[PDB]
Amino acid sequence: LQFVSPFAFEAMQKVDVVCLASLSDPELRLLLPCLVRMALCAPADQSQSWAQDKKLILRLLSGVEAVNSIVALLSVDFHALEQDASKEQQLRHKLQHGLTLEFEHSDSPRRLRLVLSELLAIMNKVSESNGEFFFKSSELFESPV
Amino acid sequence: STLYWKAWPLLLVVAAFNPENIGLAAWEEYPTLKMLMEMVMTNNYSYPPCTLTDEETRTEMLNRELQTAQREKQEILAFEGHLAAASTKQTITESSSLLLSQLTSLDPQGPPRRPPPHILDQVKSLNQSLRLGHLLCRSRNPDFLLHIIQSMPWLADLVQSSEGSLDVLPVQCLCEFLLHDAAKKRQRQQKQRQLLGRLQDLLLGPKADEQTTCEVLDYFLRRLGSSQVASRVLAMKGLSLVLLQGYQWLLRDLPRLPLFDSVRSTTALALQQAIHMETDPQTISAYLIYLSQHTPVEEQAQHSDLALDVARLVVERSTIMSHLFSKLSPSAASDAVLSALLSIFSRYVRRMRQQVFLRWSSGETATMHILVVHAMVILLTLGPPRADDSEFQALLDIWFPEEKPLPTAFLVDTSEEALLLPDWLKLRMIRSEVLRLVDAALQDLEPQQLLLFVQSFGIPVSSMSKLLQFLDQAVAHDPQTLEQNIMDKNYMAHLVEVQHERQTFHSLLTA
Q: Which segments cross the bilayer (chain B)?
């Protein structure tokens, strides 16, 4: 495994676009989601300096295949997923393939639904644990690949 | 209800002590009791039984139980209403039904019923006190443990509680206990060593007969298809123990089996099945190597099935393919895997030329699968191997002959020409560094497809240059439709400017 470099983290904190260029490829691979969200989402601040920073981000963006996958992830509507999650959570309060295989074969929205359900189940388990530490197993999160 | 539920434990113990007749009768005629002793052997008192891992059967069983309970409720209400009309002349309702909580349907051989929690508690107490699971382990006939075998989690405790069941004549049970094994610890180690020697005799030794060898190998083969990674790890570990340095047992030792040819077809079939669900890149590579070196090419059906399975691996498991062929670490093992895949697909193409109907510009005709076609395309995009390029060039010329039209495709059912190159595959070809593939993808691209492809990242520099040229040509041809398709002129103009340092269309966007 490889953790995020401290230099990478401080560069992200300082939004130092030039240092983002200095960052090596694996660090960028780890940091992709925030970077692509930054480059694609409508800019909250509309300053010309920030626009140029966005140009630099675009300059750096190339060289990643997962960019397209993340774009597809973002494409999925979120209001429907949110309401479905709320209903499922209320119900909780009141697949032949392994989870990893389902995550793989299924499309982006299915991946979202699966992971969201798993995390919310874990959250409910922690809430009801009454401070007792436990362990939960998920082949999805235990799959190195 | 109380008597009906309290009757089950007595019959369960009676069967456990007389399994030859009473136990078999309960196992066959009464599903409710049939699952009850399963509960004790598995030591898992979970309804539906943990033995049945099939989700749809579990849901079917749940729905059947729910329907039976609702029908029983309705019938009890009707009968109690009859009784009330006869005696008290009172209307019987859900909240006014006394027999509802006292009576139950007397259908022991019918649909299975939910054991009460207290019933399950006393079953588990009885099993713990009387080591009932170990009783049937001692009972050789009828040993329903092997019937269930025909699962490791509930096997663990059962085997550990049944020390005298370490051998159990059946070779399937021998292998099961070997996988389970995979002062007291020293004795277990010695017994496992003796069992390993026995199985080594049964496979490589002079006593190794086809029946026992096939049983031993097929047990591991079938359990390698378990979705749980632990079962597959145990199976491969046991196979190696009996027999890519870590896979040399499969690569080098397995071919040395005296009945290796006798079991080769079954092994190849099992590996083909397991590839569709395997996760480890190295294990997948070992599977591919063994299949390339040992898959029977004689059967047309076998060859087609292997090609289709490898195509499924290439397409559906592009993530694992990327892990294998990470450009950061081009390894000798990865190159060998690529060479094996290329050789396999070249042999398949040779057989085909010697589902969609494909006709070559040379006149050759054959009906292959578009997924397999895309598989060869992906392997071509991977680039030539470092060791051998003959197969790579042969396939490249076969599918994309130079200065020649590509092989025509048609639908088998309708004979209608189909898009041999989907947009995503064309994009992957664009990202690839092969000039011939890049040109083939570039040919016949719509303006919208060009825009979408430009939107992608990681594409080679010369490829962006060619895309810019193509977009300029499209602007020259029909700028109006392209501008209509354009959504954010500034967005695409900025992207084009980025590509520039990574023209006419840029001017059009600025306009």
A: 365-385
* Structural method: cryo-EM
B399: CB partners within 8 A, 6+ apart: B373, B376, B377, B380, B406, B407
Identify residue B107 by its one-letter amino acid code: D
The continuous run of DSSP H or E covering B335 comes out as: helix B332-353
Other CB atoms within 10 A of residue B480 CB: 8
Residues of B in contact with A139 (CB under 8 A): 229
Nearest CA in chain B to A58: B498
Reported structure resolution in angstroms: 4.2
- Is omega for the bond preceding B48 within 30 degrees of 0, making it cis? yes
Provide the H-helix boundaries in A41-136.
48-61, 66-75, 79-93, 99-105, 108-128
Three-state secondary structure readout of B240-266: HHHCCHHHHHHHHHHHHCCCHHHHHHH
- Tokens 């190794």 correspond to what residue? B208
Cα–Cα distance list, B88 to A95, B93, B315, B442 (Å): 52, 14, 73, 89
Q: How far is CA B45 from CA B36, B150, B213, in A?
A: 8, 21, 35
Order of all β-strands in the sheet with B408-411: B365-368, B356-359, B408-411
**Which of B304, B449, B417, B314 is closest to B368 using CA atoms?**
B304
Q: How many CB pairs under 8 A join A and B?
A: 54
Question: Is A101 in contact with B229 (Cβ distance < 8 A)?
Answer: no
